[PDB]
């Protein structure tokens, strides 16, 4: 009979859930544009290590990324990727870490491939700051810093980095949390 009354109801419910998705996406899509960094440095924050830990040694989760931080309002768009448990040459062994270039909107004008320092380093919120770190150079030959195709290329990085136990049994993890710092260049990079 009044079958219309539900017809509308039903119409109202999805359009409704729609917003509960949009209004939702605008949630995570509020940190990026809030944890954003345009100078070249950046701090990837990670709470819930133990949890993050397991999910990784497990299989469900194992490949975290980070706030797309750029090297200046209209420049490169790079990012990091942690592997708590570790992969490639250290899956079980210990924590691995990588740098990475996404695809940008201004990314077109930029000179390719990449070529800038990157002191990605694990901090240390202990009381002495003896936080492990390291940087390298983008090698044109090996495909990983050349002008982007998809949205993010072969996350290049220095596998073996902070080793499990040394990281787990130390002064690096605090309140089940740790901070990472990648250091890209910029100078030897003609500003806009």
């Amino acid at each position: 009979n009044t079958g219309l009354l539900e017809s509308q109801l039903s119409r109202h419910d999805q359009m409704l859930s729609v917003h509960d998705i949009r209004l939702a996406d605008m949630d995570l899509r509020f940190q990026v544009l809030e944890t954003a960094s345009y100078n070249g440095v950046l701090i990837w924050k990670i709470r819930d290590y133990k949890r993050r830990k397991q999910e990784a040694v497990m299989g469900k989760t194992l490949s975290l990324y980070s706030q797309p931080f750029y090297t200046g309002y209209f420049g490169y768009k790079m990012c990091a990727r942690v592997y708590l448990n570790g992969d490639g040459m250290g899956k079980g062994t210990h924590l691995s870490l990588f740098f990475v270039i996404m695809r940008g909107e201004y990314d077109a004008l930029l000179p390719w491939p990449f070529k800038q320092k990157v002191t990605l380093m694990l901090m240390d919120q202990g009381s002495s700051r003896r936080h492990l770190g390291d940087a390298f150079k983008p090698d044109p030959n090996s495909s990983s810093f050349k002008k982007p195709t998809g949205e993010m290329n072969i996350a290049s990085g220095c596998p073996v980095f902070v080793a499990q136990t040394v990281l787990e049994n130390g002064t690096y993890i605090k309140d089940d949390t740790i901070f990472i710092k990648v250091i890209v260049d910029t100078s030897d990079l003609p500003d806009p």
Binding site: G88, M89, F98, F136, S142, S144, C158, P159, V160
Partner: peptide
């Protein structure tokens, strides 16, 4: 001292080279 290895996303063993030695 040497860096610049690569993405270990499970699968391809490399074009006959990939690795990384450290953690020491």
């Amino acid at each position: 001292p040497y860096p610049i290895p690569e993405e270990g996303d499970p699968g391809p063993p490399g074009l006959s080279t990939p690795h990384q030695e450290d953690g020491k």
